[PDB]
DNA sequence: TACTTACATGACAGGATGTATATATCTGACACGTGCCTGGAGACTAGGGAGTAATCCCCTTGGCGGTTAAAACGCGGGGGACAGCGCGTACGTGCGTTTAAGCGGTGCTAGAGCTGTCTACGACCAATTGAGCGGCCTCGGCACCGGGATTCTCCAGTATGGCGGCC
DNA sequence: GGCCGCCATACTGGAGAATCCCGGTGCCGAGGCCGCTCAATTGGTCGTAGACAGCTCTAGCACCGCTTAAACGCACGTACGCGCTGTCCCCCGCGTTTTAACCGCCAAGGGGATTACTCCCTAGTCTCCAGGCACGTGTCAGATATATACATCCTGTCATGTAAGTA
């Protein structure tokens, strides 16, 4: 029922490709785990707010629009999912 | 002799291609499972619209690429071509986090 | 059917045919401009509410909106927005 | 015996719905009364920004020889206008990609 | 002839002497407190307005405020505030 | 002939005004209608928050052997609490100075 | 009554004092004019907002509340001046 | 011989002396003259509440202090103590200026 | 000692191959036609909010006389920044293998979302009160000041380690 | 090799100025008390908002199956980060001088805010109509495919920096 490790699912070559999109030419092996940690922290910060929206909405299925609300709260407003 | 590129060249080609390309670079389904397992860390048995999963995704990679641009800024400010995590920790403190 | 949800499809399309009669548009980009117009509308609306609070004004007028534009919009964007809105409000004032 | 119901957008000679914006501000909790020229001015500003952005988007589409507006075109247009850039610095475009940006120190000799 | 300007002086003075009977105060420290109470008040009020808009609620209740507390107020302070607020609405309904 | 005047702030048993916070929320144009538990919950939150502010200010003053709160005490009170820091990362304090903060590289040897 | 060179009125030792409050030990010679320029830009933005407020308020005297609101809109909210 | 401290000793004494300080580090009158000077360019004959002048003063001082905090974080990141304006530009541009 | 010259590693000069560059296609999202109802709109109208006049007074602005505080200038000096080269290094790149992601294909009901009720629920007005703010003054905690103690900091005699030379 | 003697380098005590720190004195602003006033509440009333029930139907979830991108892991080529030494220079510290900032004092009036009057405006409501949304449905831009050029970056050769012979 429960899952224990899917932060591994954000794979190392995916991080590598993003750093290519982010413009990194050389990536230490120490980079991947701490990038996983900081994205982990950020996603927790987002999803905690999103869940707070969700039981504020009395719902059990998470919608994208509350994700938009949480991102706009945290100053990382995303275009393409509102409404 | 089989062909082999010098270091950075495929790195730079990847840099050019994903600066040109716009698609997601992470597999969507492990990301979805990660979303659900951290959801049950706050509330068990939550359900997620797929649009919410990809919206959280493009938000995640945009946040990440912003941090890595700051990381490259610090690393060239550290006179370097290889980044180390202290660059990211520095940039995270600079953003006020 | 379903409930009608308001969107900015047709007005953006009219303005697009004003600026580019020849081109098409993707629906993903269309939702992005819907988010854009809603977001900037919210920014200007909240700013106008702030200034109406600061001047203790119960009514937000085009003076307040122009002030908010001069705050948020940078430079030539602000002044040509002033020009466009001024021309529009003169035409609407002259019906 | 009422005359023709004319539209306030065309009264301003404009495309954006004056009635929608005025109703939203009446329902948006910003002021209980809204000045008469306020939504007209707001819609004029919104149409001006939207028109210049769509012009840039069409020009960028023509630049990469495409005839349809793409979010990649939106990124490459808005992020390359510096006043639109710092107008929209913290705003994310879905599937917009990134600006082509290589640092000169990253390029070889 | 002068016009009254409202400030939160006496309440912060009350709770200071409640928790520290022997402790004094400076007035510009009270200015920083007034700035604090208005700042956090407008943060919570704007977030509550946002939540009322998102869930189509025309009325901002304690659930909205508590939601805004979990959003803006981080962690341990949020749980304490939830605790004394639940006590506070409870004794209020009993009063 | 009339009920005795006993305020809702006394009903909460709390010093922060139920009435004033309620009228500022109603006047602040966030919604035209406000639930009853909203201002009492808010006032409880505010008075509690100011309570730990006053605790930290009191210990800061007791440390610097003054009985009166100075904004330097407020600086030391705010910046030494991680949740208060997360609350007030972008907030500027008049005549507060900074934390006593030196990097280890600046010290001799 | 016109003023021409009061950016130099923010003196070099005042810059040194501020960096001591910032905890800066050693300060290069190129620093001071760059600090003058960036503070000039910051002040220009803030008082541009404040002047916009004041003309929108139909006033002539710059008030500290306008300073407070201008700093709020730049995300630099200040406590201790009647806010 | 007259007494002479080694370079950095008086610097560190200034560090401790101005972190313990709370007073403004700018002379009041030339700062007021400068704000009148710059504001005259945007609107003529502007008058300033003196409290607003000290408000601008303290806000600008703390904004600069936060800037040099970001700067010397970059400097210890850059293994230097002699900060240079590229550090400030790095702090601004990573901050988004 | 400089001039020339060799050589070998840094500089000068041309190809495989991944992406760029030429159409062919077939599709389904672009794009356009259609019912509609809801969304905008208009006339009156009741009422409310902002602009305007006066004004005054108090709070800002300019002027002036000294006073060092603050700036300013200059000079000894230690530290700082940092590059050439070196050197252990740390990771990009090749590329085959595994597997679970990806695609695509089914069944179903959880709850998302939409619809009728109904009563909580809370804004609002006249009145009344009581707390809470303007005003003041005043006195004791705190600012300013003088004098040791502490404290820190720079130096210089020194002990001790280390190293060499003679027996 | 031992022994003795001599240099090297930090060990360490000592001393004096800067700042805590202790005691003395005024002063200023906390605070505490007095007078006003407005705001906050209460009772009721009246309109209405959303909570609740409940259906329904639909996409998330679960299950199933074929494919190959993923991925990852080991080898290896190769470039990275930073430090030693040095090196060059750049503000830091330590003064002196000077000047205008500061502080105290004086005169002006600007304008900001306050009260009253006024009148400009704006939404409510009711109704009416039309335009964009929902739906539906053709349809060609491009997604995909196949074939070809050129970068392009790598690879194979120029060149001169520097080492060496010798006039």
PDB file of C-alpha atoms in Angstrom, chain A:
ATOM      1  CA  UNK A   1       0.000   0.000   0.000  1.00  0.00           C
ATOM      2  CA  UNK A   2       2.588   2.544   1.108  1.00  0.00           C
ATOM      3  CA  UNK A   3       5.690   3.533  -0.865  1.00  0.00           C
ATOM      4  CA  UNK A   4       9.086   4.075   0.699  1.00  0.00           C
ATOM      5  CA  UNK A   5      11.500   5.305  -2.006  1.00  0.00           C
ATOM      6  CA  UNK A   6      10.439   7.212  -5.114  1.00  0.00           C
ATOM      7  CA  UNK A   7      12.727  10.217  -4.602  1.00  0.00           C
ATOM      8  CA  UNK A   8      15.140   7.873  -6.379  1.00  0.00           C
ATOM      9  CA  UNK A   9      12.680   8.052  -9.284  1.00  0.00           C
ATOM     10  CA  UNK A  10      13.920  11.565 -10.015  1.00  0.00           C
ATOM     11  CA  UNK A  11      16.852   9.874 -11.670  1.00  0.00           C
ATOM     12  CA  UNK A  12      20.449  11.045 -11.968  1.00  0.00           C
ATOM     13  CA  UNK A  13      20.403  11.439 -15.805  1.00  0.00           C
ATOM     14  CA  UNK A  14      17.198  13.485 -15.448  1.00  0.00           C
ATOM     15  CA  UNK A  15      19.088  15.784 -13.074  1.00  0.00           C
ATOM     16  CA  UNK A  16      21.935  15.818 -15.608  1.00  0.00           C
ATOM     17  CA  UNK A  17      19.618  16.809 -18.455  1.00  0.00           C
ATOM     18  CA  UNK A  18      18.066  19.572 -16.347  1.00  0.00           C
ATOM     19  CA  UNK A  19      21.496  20.930 -15.503  1.00  0.00           C
ATOM     20  CA  UNK A  20      22.144  20.929 -19.241  1.00  0.00           C
ATOM     21  CA  UNK A  21      18.926  22.945 -19.547  1.00  0.00           C
ATOM     22  CA  UNK A  22      20.161  24.908 -16.557  1.00  0.00           C
ATOM     23  CA  UNK A  23      23.491  25.397 -18.304  1.00  0.00           C
ATOM     24  CA  UNK A  24      25.776  23.275 -16.122  1.00  0.00           C
ATOM     25  CA  UNK A  25      28.666  21.821 -18.094  1.00  0.00           C
ATOM     26  CA  UNK A  26      30.183  19.657 -15.331  1.00  0.00           C
ATOM     27  CA  UNK A  27      28.170  18.096 -12.523  1.00  0.00           C
ATOM     28  CA  UNK A  28      29.785  16.669  -9.420  1.00  0.00           C
ATOM     29  CA  UNK A  29      28.641  13.317  -8.104  1.00  0.00           C
ATOM     30  CA  UNK A  30      27.887  15.169  -4.874  1.00  0.00           C
ATOM     31  CA  UNK A  31      25.355  17.316  -6.757  1.00  0.00           C
ATOM     32  CA  UNK A  32      22.598  14.764  -7.376  1.00  0.00           C
ATOM     33  CA  UNK A  33      21.680  13.774  -3.812  1.00  0.00           C
ATOM     34  CA  UNK A  34      21.592  17.323  -2.442  1.00  0.00           C
ATOM     35  CA  UNK A  35      19.626  18.523  -5.467  1.00  0.00           C
ATOM     36  CA  UNK A  36      17.210  15.715  -4.633  1.00  0.00           C
ATOM     37  CA  UNK A  37      17.153  17.020  -1.069  1.00  0.00           C
ATOM     38  CA  UNK A  38      16.419  20.622  -1.978  1.00  0.00           C
ATOM     39  CA  UNK A  39      13.773  19.707  -4.555  1.00  0.00           C
ATOM     40  CA  UNK A  40      12.385  17.402  -1.875  1.00  0.00           C
ATOM     41  CA  UNK A  41      12.152  20.357   0.509  1.00  0.00           C
ATOM     42  CA  UNK A  42      10.552  22.543  -2.163  1.00  0.00           C
ATOM     43  CA  UNK A  43       7.987  19.931  -3.158  1.00  0.00           C
ATOM     44  CA  UNK A  44       7.122  19.365   0.508  1.00  0.00           C
ATOM     45  CA  UNK A  45       6.625  23.109   0.905  1.00  0.00           C
ATOM     46  CA  UNK A  46       4.370  23.197  -2.153  1.00  0.00           C
ATOM     47  CA  UNK A  47       2.382  20.048  -1.438  1.00  0.00           C
ATOM     48  CA  UNK A  48       1.823  20.885   2.234  1.00  0.00           C
ATOM     49  CA  UNK A  49       0.072  24.043   1.094  1.00  0.00           C
ATOM     50  CA  UNK A  50      -1.708  22.100  -1.657  1.00  0.00           C
ATOM     51  CA  UNK A  51      -3.022  19.550   0.831  1.00  0.00           C
ATOM     52  CA  UNK A  52      -4.048  22.421   3.120  1.00  0.00           C
ATOM     53  CA  UNK A  53      -6.017  23.820   0.177  1.00  0.00           C
ATOM     54  CA  UNK A  54      -7.467  20.357  -0.439  1.00  0.00           C
ATOM     55  CA  UNK A  55      -9.000  19.721   2.970  1.00  0.00           C
ATOM     56  CA  UNK A  56      -9.916  23.380   2.916  1.00  0.00           C
ATOM     57  CA  UNK A  57     -11.790  22.414  -0.257  1.00  0.00           C
ATOM     58  CA  UNK A  58     -13.353  19.345   1.473  1.00  0.00           C
ATOM     59  CA  UNK A  59     -12.053  17.216  -1.406  1.00  0.00           C
ATOM     60  CA  UNK A  60     -10.147  13.939  -1.602  1.00  0.00           C
ATOM     61  CA  UNK A  61      -8.790  14.303  -5.154  1.00  0.00           C
ATOM     62  CA  UNK A  62      -6.050  16.881  -5.640  1.00  0.00           C
ATOM     63  CA  UNK A  63      -6.666  19.333  -8.484  1.00  0.00           C
ATOM     64  CA  UNK A  64      -4.180  21.371 -10.485  1.00  0.00           C
ATOM     65  CA  UNK A  65      -5.854  24.672  -9.643  1.00  0.00           C
ATOM     66  CA  UNK A  66      -4.874  24.504  -5.970  1.00  0.00           C
ATOM     67  CA  UNK A  67      -1.334  23.674  -7.102  1.00  0.00           C
ATOM     68  CA  UNK A  68      -1.511  26.946  -9.053  1.00  0.00           C
ATOM     69  CA  UNK A  69      -2.737  28.735  -5.912  1.00  0.00           C
ATOM     70  CA  UNK A  70       0.111  27.329  -3.806  1.00  0.00           C
ATOM     71  CA  UNK A  71       2.722  28.207  -6.429  1.00  0.00           C
ATOM     72  CA  UNK A  72       1.351  31.739  -6.757  1.00  0.00           C
ATOM     73  CA  UNK A  73       1.530  32.048  -2.971  1.00  0.00           C
ATOM     74  CA  UNK A  74       5.194  30.999  -2.978  1.00  0.00           C
ATOM     75  CA  UNK A  75       6.142  33.506  -5.674  1.00  0.00           C
ATOM     76  CA  UNK A  76       6.573  30.828  -8.361  1.00  0.00           C
ATOM     77  CA  UNK A  77       3.428  31.530 -10.381  1.00  0.00           C
ATOM     78  CA  UNK A  78       2.881  29.112 -13.274  1.00  0.00           C
ATOM     79  CA  UNK A  79       1.034  29.974 -16.477  1.00  0.00           C
ATOM     80  CA  UNK A  80      -0.886  27.299 -18.352  1.00  0.00           C
ATOM     81  CA  UNK A  81      -3.101  25.640 -15.724  1.00  0.00           C
ATOM     82  CA  UNK A  82      -5.372  28.353 -14.336  1.00  0.00           C
ATOM     83  CA  UNK A  83      -9.081  27.817 -14.825  1.00  0.00           C
TER      84      UNK A  83
END
